[PDB]
Design a protein around this ligand. Structure first.
Ligand SMILES: [Co+2]
Ligand SMILES: [Co+2]
Length: 215
């Protein structure tokens, strides 16, 4: 897997296949870059507007196409923090209605609130399903599924192997989180890669790890 850095190390992209890359920025955080025939689509942007601009510029230059859309997986600063940049550049910022209203309540500009419990999007050739499994890391957390690759973007709902505890639970629902993870396992019975919110890429084992952290 080919791995390309910004100058400073603060942003890194790692290839999963011909058209899917994982983006990581610095505490580490992950999203996806989807290289589609109609433009670049991100699953999550970054901690703040500075890193989000850097991410966008790196990918636009490398892939020679514009970022057209971003899927925001919950309303916390690490996910929603580059919203201002997205809005001012005319990048469509997709979210559930709940994610949008939490973003507003917390002083952020609002994403679209277009995503339902299950939403199916097509960006050129690239199919993307978004799924709200229930409450867990936050009230609003969603997952993203790429049916052409069986790749799940878990976000902070899903903990990496390295994670030895649940992290920030101030906004979490620790008695629902297990049912939510089960909902994902029931929906996606054959998973090739699982991208956690933070940490290394794994497989279904990361969902099982999260279940154990919840005991
Ligand atoms: Co969060
Ligand atoms: Co997080």
């Amino acid at each position: 897997k080919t791995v390309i850095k910004n100058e400073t190390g603060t942003i890194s992209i790692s290839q999963l296949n011909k058209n899917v890359w994982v983006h990581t920025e610095l505490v580490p955080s992950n999203g996806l870059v989807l290289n589609t025939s109609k433009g670049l689509v991100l699953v999550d942007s970054s901690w703040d507007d500075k890193l989000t601009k850097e991410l966008i510029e790196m990918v636009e230059k490398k892939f020679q196409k514009r970022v057209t859309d971003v899927i925001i997986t919950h309303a916390h600063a690490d996910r929603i923090g580059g919203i201002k940049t997205l809005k001012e550049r005319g990048i469509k910022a997709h979210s559930t209605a709940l994610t949008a209203e939490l973003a507003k309540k917390n002083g952020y500009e609002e994403p679209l609130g277009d995503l339902q419990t299950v939403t199916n999007l097509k960006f050129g050739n690239m199919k993307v399903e978004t799924f709200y499994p229930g409450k867990g890391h936050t009230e609003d957390n969603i997952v993203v599924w790429l049916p052409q690759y069986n790749i799940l973007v878990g976000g902070c709902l899903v903990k990496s192997t390295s994670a030895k505890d649940l992290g920030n639970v101030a906004d979490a629902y620790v008695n629902e989180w297990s049912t939510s993870i089960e909902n994902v396992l029931k929906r996606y019975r054959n998973i090739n890669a699982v991208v956690p919110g933070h940490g290394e890429v794994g497989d279904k084992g990361l969902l099982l790890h999260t279940l154990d952290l919840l005991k």
